[PDB]
From Swiss-Prot:
Interacts with Cas1. Coiled coil: none annotated. Disruption phenotype: Infection with phage DSM3 inhibits biofilm formation; disrupting this gene restores biofilm formation upon infection with DMS3 infection. Normal biofilm formation in the absence of phage infection. Decreased production of crRNA in the presence or absence of phage. Disruption of the entire Y.pestis-subtype CRISPR region disrupts crRNA production but does not alter phage resistance (possibly OLNs PA14_33350 to PA14_33310, plus the flanking CRISPR loci), indicating this CRISPR is not involved in phage resistance. In the N-terminal section; belongs to the CRISPR-associated nuclease Cas3-HD family. It comes from Pseudomonas aeruginosa (strain UCBPP-PA14). The gene is cas3. CRISPR (clustered regularly interspaced short palindromic repeat), is an adaptive immune system that provides protection against mobile genetic elements (viruses, transposable elements and conjugative plasmids). CRISPR clusters contain sequences complementary to antecedent mobile elements and target invading nucleic acids. CRISPR clusters are transcribed and processed into CRISPR RNA (crRNA). Cas3 plus Cascade participate in CRISPR interference, the third stage of CRISPR immunity (Potential). This is CRISPR-associated nuclease/helicase Cas3 subtype I-F/YPEST.
Amino acid sequence: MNILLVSQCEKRALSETRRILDQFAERRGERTWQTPITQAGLDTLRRLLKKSAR
DNA sequence: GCCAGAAACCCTCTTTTTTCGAGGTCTCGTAACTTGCTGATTTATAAGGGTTTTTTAAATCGTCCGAAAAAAGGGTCGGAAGCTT
């Protein structure tokens, strides 16, 4: 597992998306993150993002 | 001859520094005021009832805006159905 995450969110949503992702990966751009992570970890990240999606 | 460093040249951004402009504000100079002379001619006016133009409100219309409602979409949970064992 070696992940790159990119965000295209808007307005209020992008504040939330930042709140989620920033806990799992260093921010390497205004809307991008990139780190290694375990497969189970990634699955949990996906679940958390889906839990509250505008 | 090789290698390194420093220096000269090119371009753009960032920040002060200077400059400029608008405009605001005050004060004094002065061309055109005001006050004073006469007498022939022109103009205004005391009241109030009937009569034109503009103001003013109301209504209407149109537009715009905002809010609410409805639609749309992202997703979760539980249940039922289908398939496989």
